[PDB]
Point group: C2
Chain length 132, copies 2
């Protein structure tokens, strides 16, 4: 009974990159996960995101999800998803089952940094020697 | 016999971050390894370095070791080390046993970039919802 919450009345979510969701019917997944975007998922990733329920439009709960990101990055699409308690159509969901996936995109500043990221210099060092 | 070379007559070395040295008397180690410096070893690392034997000063062979580095980085001290064939005092060394360790330091540009690396922005996204 308590692990059953009406999704539309859940006020807020705090989702972490190193914690898993709760589940029963489905497999646990990261509470926060990069899934694409113009910058991709292989390098910088936020560790936490804060979501607030902004109301209900007749179809979906409206989530505003924010976090501090390095200046080179922003979110593309973000998607919140929870485990409906009885089924996927249930309006109640399993407590703790919500997660977020995001596309990570470059900002305008990020794309300039990317343009310049390849710059290198030939550096010579006169090495010591160690006998072994 | 062939795996025995006089170190002073070895013309050049090409050392790779993902290959191990040869050894007998000692354990194999990475041909190229970061060991300290003002930037440290946890992030960017060169993958290869090219060393040329620049002569003999009466004590040590003089190695000049160079590679292309990202503009934010340079080498602090670098040290070449090979496995002497019979002992640590042997002037012949085991073929393939040479490696290099380096300190990785920030350049002047690197330190400015580091100064600014922490800059962030609060980014809000209005998330879609996915039923499951």
């Amino acid at each position: 009974d308590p692990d059953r919450m009406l999704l539309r009345d859940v006020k807020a979510l705090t989702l972490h990159y190193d914690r898993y969701t709760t589940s029963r019917r489905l497999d646990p997944i990261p509470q926060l996960k990069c899934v694409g975007g113009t910058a991709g998922c292989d390098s910088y990733t936020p560790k936490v995101i804060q979501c607030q329920n902004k109301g209900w439009d007749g179809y979906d709960v409206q989530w505003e999800c924010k976090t501090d990101l390095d200046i080179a990055y922003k979110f593309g699409k973000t998607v919140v998803s929870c485990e409906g308690y009885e089924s996927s159509e249930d309006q109640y969901v399993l407590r703790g089952s919500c997660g977020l996936e995001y596309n990570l995109d470059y900002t305008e500043l990020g794309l300039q940094k990317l343009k310049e990221s390849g710059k290198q210099h030939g550096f010579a060092s006169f090495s010591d020697y160690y006998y072994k």
